[PDB]
């Protein structure tokens, strides 16, 4: 019905830095070898999108943003063995193309046929599958979700479950992976630790589920918004600190309350003071600190290499560690087998030709996650 | 024919910051409870030792410092078990009590009871040992090997095999176990893969030797002095790189070297700039990067998180992440197994009286390690 040809459909075309998403009319070409076309059901709305707005995350522009998502697979290209036409499916930013050094690696998952090192805004050969009136528009991160259809290459497509509720389980395409695996996969949070999260938006949240998930003993909530620490306990956190309710440095708060210091600490908020903060608060012989994320425009930070040379570990990672087109897949099936829930992460639905005000709620910090629907 | 009483001997006492290492008349006394006196044979030189000199590890004064050595048991106050006099003896700067978090901890060993995060210069009880014409002088580390004669806690002494060579294993003491360890033991280099050493004294040639026992297929020793290099061949470098012999940073370097990055690397040196360069010269998904000395005057690195948030790991450790008292006597075993060589570390050998003149040795760079005998 439409294999083969173009598609005519909407999409949320950035044109230029610091605009608003302009709804248009685009031109999607079918899938070349080794490509997928998919038909979007949902996606969420991540700080990542907003930074190429901002400009903090470059990338050719102008281009169709989006990165989280979830759809259905509309055509295959020639040679594609690993989805098929109606298949339920969740693009993947971080490919996995199974040959690379780093895909090989057993602990690496950040493969070299990335597009977030260098980014083209392409697809893998060099080209976009997107015109508007004529002009080429940009890949980014070889994904482009914030559009009806989009074309992808088969690194960055995992199918999932068929019976998989699409609007829920999109957020395993960035969000819940990066946080959860940043417990799970990254730390490997151990039974009956006490672990300390600094941010409570949704990959925070996200991070407190792998705490528990992996049977954490005491899970310490650390955020300036008190009003984050309703839900924070509902997933999971045993207690939640207000650093703004004390007269003494955060660090110093949480070694005691642990008795001098936690196993694992996470720093979710990209800030350079509390990923030092988080760093200081682990156990000094054992402790273990991750970074889940840094914001793409971020200076240098001062820290003394002192806190390391007792037995500290500093890590991060992308995607929460996962291994991206094995884990995707792994991810729903828990989630279909009611091993952990994604509805407390949701806040926010709203139709697609609405994007403008699901970002407004992104950036005023209303929303934990929006998403949108197709 | 000693034990119970004071024993008079020589030791060298610093009496102040920045002055020679003054020959003394002490009286030691003998073992209190859970203590064990010992009959120093050989202690080396080491860096930590000149910066209780320099002022830069700040320990009470007037001080016996020493801390990397071995001898045999002269003594053993009441209630004494793991060792028996005339055993042969290494003193662990870093306890192992057993009871602690850190010591039941299966990755940690940084002894809770150490006396290097908040230095007294006593024994574990508070008191000294040693007097000097009535004046007490403080232990350094709970060890205080550069005396004829010492008193240590249970906690802080190992027995070694009594066949072992006390001129040589001393070496487990400090140097060799903590470049072994960084490698074997905190990084845990994994046969085939490509290290980096930066610092190629005692310790990086000990970190070399643990990339060889781990079967690390290139080891590349970095090192601005080119007299440095025939050694560490010998020990197992496959190449060595002269960072002044280069138009380009060095961390581009050993990118282009590795083909895009090593699989671990190590700073020896204590230097921030190159603490920052070995971490940015390990592959970006999968590296690890492992500190294995920081001068104790330390001022903060500047670093770009961005570094860690591809997938790096970064890390340190005390005595190369060896719980001190299991592991010192697997190490001598080791030595006596002939699984590997302690005499290419062992440059310059003088009698305990020429104490000064080994630090000048190591003060001018001429020496990789100093033993001093008994
Ligand atoms: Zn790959
Ligand atoms: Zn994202
Ligand atoms: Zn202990
Ligand atoms: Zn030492």
Redesign the interface.
Known sequence: STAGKVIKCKAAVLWEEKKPFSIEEVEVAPPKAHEVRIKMVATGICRSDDHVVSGTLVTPLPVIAGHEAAGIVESIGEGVTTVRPGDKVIPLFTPQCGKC??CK?P????C?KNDL?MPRGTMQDGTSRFTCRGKPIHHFLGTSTFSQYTVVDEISVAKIDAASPLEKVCLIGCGFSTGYGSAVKVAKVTQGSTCAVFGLGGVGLSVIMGCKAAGAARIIGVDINKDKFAKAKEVGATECVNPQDYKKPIQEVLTEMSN?GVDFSFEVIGR?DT?VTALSCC????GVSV?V??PPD?????????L???????????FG?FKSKDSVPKLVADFMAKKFALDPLITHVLPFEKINEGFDLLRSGESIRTILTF
């Open positions: 050094r780093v690696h602990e690496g998952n950040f070299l090192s001098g350079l990923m156990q000094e012989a054992y970074i994320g840094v971020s200076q240098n930070l001062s820290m003394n290499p002192m390391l040379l007792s037995g500290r570990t500093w890590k991060g990672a992308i560690g």
